[PDB]
Design a protein around this ligand. Structure first.
Ligand SMILES: COc1cccc([C@@H]2CCOC[C@@H]2N)c1
Ligand SMILES: [Zn+2]
Length: 140
């Protein structure tokens, strides 16, 4: 589980979005596993605006933050899960590292701020949904 809180936006894994999120939906892309809902309070996360390929992600299933190299956001084939059929997830970054399903929402961060959230992985990989193209998260 986990979320990014930037301005009056909450960014979650689409597959973990709650009832209030949809009701309060701003934007969702099933192909990115992202959902942004509206918030009453102001968030204090900074979104990275960069092409960093190194960062640190939180792994709830190890209670540990791991330094990782990761691929640039790409269209990647992702095996079926309980939440999605087998399909090409867009804007997805892979690293070698431990993840289990429940680690989705863990932040990946570089020196510039939040890069993305754990979305997929397994067999020693972890996939992160990029949020760094979502320039509108920083305004309105
Ligand atoms: C971060 O998310 C993860 C991490 C590990 C495994 C999975 C699921 C396990 C079931 O088969 C589909 C996926 N590979 C997701
Ligand atoms: Zn960066």
């Amino acid at each position: 589980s986990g979320a990014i809180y930037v301005g009056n936006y909450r960014v979650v894994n689409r597959h973990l979005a709650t009832h209030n999120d949809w009701a309060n939906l701003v934007w969702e892309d099933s192909s990115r596993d992202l959902l942004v809902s509206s918030t009453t309070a102001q968030g204090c996360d900074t979104i990275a605006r960069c092409d960093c390929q190194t960062g640190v992600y939180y792994c709830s299933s190890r209670r540990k933050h791991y330094p990782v190299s990761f691929s640039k956001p790409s269209l990647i084939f992702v095996e079926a899960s309980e939440y999605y059929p087998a399909r090409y997830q867009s804007h997805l970054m892979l690293a070698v590292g431990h993840s289990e399903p429940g680690d989705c929402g863990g932040i990946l961060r570089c020196q510039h701020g939040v890069v993305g959230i754990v979305s997929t992985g397994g067999n020693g990989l972890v996939g992160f949904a990029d949020v760094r193209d979502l320039l509108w998260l920083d305004e309105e």
